[PDB]
Design a binder for this molecule. Structure first.
Ligand SMILES: COc1cc(=O)n(C)nc1-c1ccccc1Oc1ccccc1
Length: 109
């Protein structure tokens, strides 16, 4: 059911916020600070920013009809990171480590 599915999504996002993954998850906790040095072009490249705190707020406001809608925002968050940064950037390796956590849980729910 969609209700149980969404409860599982909340559980996946709670693990993504956990201390276990904090060493690589922290760039994704809050919206990208577009005022920070080096990020002056973020809004020109990334048309739909997304982060974990925004996804948590959307789950709380019932903005996802189902797990597929939630999963689309988590994957949008990673895709933004892959699109914006050079492929060898430290933040892309962190996105991949976090996406490993997400994909494994999302597949097994
Ligand atoms: C290029 O900076 C980013 C691109 C991006 O896609 N995200 C999601 N966040 C950032 C970012 C923003 C502010 C501070 C640090 C940041 O990440 C870094 C992580 C490791 C090394 C350097 C930067």
């Amino acid at each position: 059911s969609h209700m149980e599915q969404l409860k599982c999504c909340s559980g996946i996002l709670k693990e993504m916020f956990a201390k276990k993954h904090a060493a690589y998850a922290w760039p994704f906790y809050k919206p990208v600070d577009v005022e920070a040095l080096g990020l002056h072009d973020y809004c020109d490249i990334i048309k739909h920013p997304m982060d974990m705190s925004t996804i948590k707020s959307k789950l709380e406001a019932r903005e996802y009809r189902d797990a597929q809608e939630f999963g689309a925002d988590v994957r949008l968050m990673f895709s933004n990171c892959y699109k914006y940064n050079p492929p060898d950037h430290e933040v892309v390796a962190m996105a991949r480590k976090l996406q490993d956590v997400f994909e494994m849980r999302f597949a097994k729910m």
